Design an enzyme around this catalytic site. Structure first.
Site, short mmCIF file in Angstrom:
data_model
loop_
_atom_site.label_atom_id
_atom_site.label_comp_id
_atom_site.label_asym_id
_atom_site.label_seq_id
_atom_site.Cartn_x
_atom_site.Cartn_y
_atom_site.Cartn_z
N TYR A 27 47.20 -11.67 -42.16
CA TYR A 27 46.03 -12.55 -42.25
C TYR A 27 45.72 -13.20 -43.60
O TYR A 27 44.76 -13.97 -43.69
CB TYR A 27 44.79 -11.80 -41.75
CG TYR A 27 44.79 -11.51 -40.26
CD1 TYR A 27 45.50 -10.42 -39.74
CD2 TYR A 27 44.08 -12.31 -39.37
CE1 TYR A 27 45.50 -10.15 -38.37
CE2 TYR A 27 44.07 -12.05 -38.00
CZ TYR A 27 44.78 -10.96 -37.51
OH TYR A 27 44.76 -10.69 -36.16
N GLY A 29 46.64 -15.84 -45.36
CA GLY A 29 47.33 -17.11 -45.37
C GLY A 29 46.69 -18.03 -44.35
O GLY A 29 45.59 -17.74 -43.84
N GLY A 31 47.69 -18.73 -41.24
CA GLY A 31 47.67 -18.11 -39.92
C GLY A 31 46.65 -17.01 -39.71
O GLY A 31 45.74 -16.80 -40.52
N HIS A 47 37.67 -11.39 -43.61
CA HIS A 47 37.32 -12.60 -44.34
C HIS A 47 37.46 -13.80 -43.41
O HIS A 47 36.76 -14.81 -43.55
CB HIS A 47 38.26 -12.78 -45.52
CG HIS A 47 38.00 -14.02 -46.32
ND1 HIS A 47 38.88 -15.08 -46.36
CD2 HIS A 47 36.97 -14.35 -47.13
CE1 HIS A 47 38.41 -16.01 -47.18
NE2 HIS A 47 37.25 -15.59 -47.65
N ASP A 48 38.39 -13.69 -42.46
CA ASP A 48 38.64 -14.73 -41.47
C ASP A 48 37.51 -14.69 -40.46
O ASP A 48 37.06 -15.72 -39.98
CB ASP A 48 39.97 -14.46 -40.76
CG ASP A 48 41.05 -15.42 -41.16
OD1 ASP A 48 40.80 -16.24 -42.07
OD2 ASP A 48 42.14 -15.36 -40.57
N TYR A 51 34.52 -16.41 -42.13
CA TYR A 51 34.60 -17.87 -42.14
C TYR A 51 34.38 -18.36 -40.70
O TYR A 51 33.66 -19.32 -40.45
CB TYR A 51 35.99 -18.33 -42.58
CG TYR A 51 36.19 -18.52 -44.07
CD1 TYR A 51 35.24 -18.12 -45.00
CD2 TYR A 51 37.36 -19.12 -44.54
CE1 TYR A 51 35.46 -18.31 -46.37
CE2 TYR A 51 37.59 -19.31 -45.89
CZ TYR A 51 36.64 -18.90 -46.80
OH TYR A 51 36.90 -19.09 -48.14
N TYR A 64 31.26 -24.48 -54.22
CA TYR A 64 30.03 -23.74 -54.43
C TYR A 64 30.06 -23.13 -55.81
O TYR A 64 31.10 -23.12 -56.48
CB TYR A 64 29.85 -22.65 -53.37
CG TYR A 64 30.93 -21.58 -53.36
CD1 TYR A 64 30.98 -20.60 -54.35
CD2 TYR A 64 31.89 -21.56 -52.35
CE1 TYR A 64 31.98 -19.62 -54.33
CE2 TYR A 64 32.89 -20.59 -52.32
CZ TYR A 64 32.94 -19.62 -53.31
OH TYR A 64 33.94 -18.66 -53.26
N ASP A 89 33.59 -14.89 -49.43
CA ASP A 89 34.61 -14.74 -50.46
C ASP A 89 34.40 -13.51 -51.36
O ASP A 89 35.35 -12.75 -51.62
CB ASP A 89 34.65 -16.01 -51.32
CG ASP A 89 35.14 -17.23 -50.55
OD1 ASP A 89 35.55 -17.09 -49.38
OD2 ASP A 89 35.11 -18.34 -51.13
#
Length: 121
Positions: A27, A29, A31, A47-48, A51, A64, A89
């Site tokens: 994960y 990257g 993809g 983190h994915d 988002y 930001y 992040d």
């Protein structure tokens, strides 16, 4: 964006986001498929999911601002998106630092055809 995010990784793990975290495991990257190989990859998975839960925003583009307070990342208070993205992040950047002791070179440049399975957020 990846510009702000890259600064956080660098500033927390001491390593350059690219190429140490741009193509790691399943994960870390572009993809996102299968089962996270280890803790670091797991950091990338959530983190994915972070988002992915900001429909009204554009995580990779929107810039930001944040700062350092007592050595800790402090997300300022621009727009809701800027704030939210910054918060996604920071959690990740710190997740990276917290699991440095299990980071493996063996999961670098991992081929994505080996990422099978499924995982809900």
């Amino acid at each position: 964006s990846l510009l702000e995010f890259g600064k956080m990784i660098l500033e927390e793990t001491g390593k350059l986001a690219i190429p140490s975290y741009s193509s790691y495991g399943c994960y870390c990257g572009w993809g996102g498929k299968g089962t996270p190989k280890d803790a670091t990859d797991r950091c990338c998975f959530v983190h994915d999911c972070c988002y992915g839960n900001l429909p009204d925003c554009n995580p990779k583009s929107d810039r930001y601002k944040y700062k350092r307070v007592n050595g800790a990342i402090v997300c300022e208070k621009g727009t809701s998106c800027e704030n939210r993205i910054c918060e996604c992040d920071k959690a990740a950047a710190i997740c990276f630092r917290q699991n440095l002791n299990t980071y493996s070179k063996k999961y670098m440049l991992y081929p994505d055809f080996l990422c099978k399975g499924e995982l809900k957020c």
